[PDB]
Design a protein around this ligand. Structure first.
Ligand SMILES: [K+]
Ligand SMILES: [K+]
Ligand SMILES: [K+]
Lengths: 93, 93, 93, 93
């Protein structure tokens, strides 16, 4: 319960950092900087864009390292203790 | 047995939601909307396309979150209790 | 020991199927069809290309499902019981 | 403690090998070769570029195999025993 809330806020602040960086350093639109931030951390990736400034490239490097860990954690638990009991509850005869 | 069937139907409805959204909001061909839906959730990604409407971008965001969890689950078990005993059965002398 | 060899041959036959399909249906060069096959299953993805025939798109769909499971398994164990004792052996004082 | 340092240096040497290969064989700028090396191993991928020489393609193949294992290991533990106690320490009332 209080672990989803935590790993949620840490993901919010993580995504906030990226949206400000890319919307500032790389010149993306806020919504675009958010998307890029989301697709890189979940490792989906963006097919239409890549960081054009060496600054953006180095940030993205450290960003991926500090991020892939905590972003997927929220993906695991967002299901494990949230999406799961919700789907178990629909099965029960 | 009845867990593969479940995580299968939840993946069907998940993929259905995406195919309708992208084929409607982003204007992709049904088969294309399906592909995009599949490559984003398995995190492979699409190199030829990215959501062009801010609507599609936000949907994809929430879509990736609610999806990467249950899609890989079907990938894990589709093997664990299906692909595996099938390959163990071919080894037995 | 005999588990790396197995998950290795299953990955060989998996990669072989893809290289023939893409080099035939999509018209890629053998080496290119192999690369695409490798980057899609490890979920890295290809930024320069996507299946252009609906046949290639549907194959890739089923291909990703039957594949991401067994390809990463070889990635896990290729390290766990191969890359690891090799690196533990270099540490020992 | 001494396991983060290890999996860190193995990732440094891994990333070094790639940066030299791509900056030499594919003709990327050092910083670009590094980025590509990072995005392929974490499976994020690059949307703006793909290996253009068959040499680069085959290297990338073996590179992804020997790499995805040890790179994510550093991602797991970089959090587990580093990012985690750091975040647990901020919660304590
Ligand atoms: K990925
Ligand atoms: K990717
Ligand atoms: K592209």
């Amino acid at each position: 319960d209080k672990e989803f809330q935590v790993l949620f806020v840490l993901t919010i602040l993580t995504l906030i950092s990226g949206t400000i960086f890319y919307s500032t350093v790389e010149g993306l639109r806020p919504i675009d900087a958010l998307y890029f931030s989301v697709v890189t951390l979940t490792t989906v990736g963006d097919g239409d864009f890549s960081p054009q400034t060496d600054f953006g490239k180095i940030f993205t490097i450290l960003y991926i390292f500090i991020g892939i860990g905590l972003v997927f954690g929220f993906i695991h638990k967002l299901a494990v203790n949230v999406q799961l009991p919700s789907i178990l509850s629909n099965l029960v005869p």
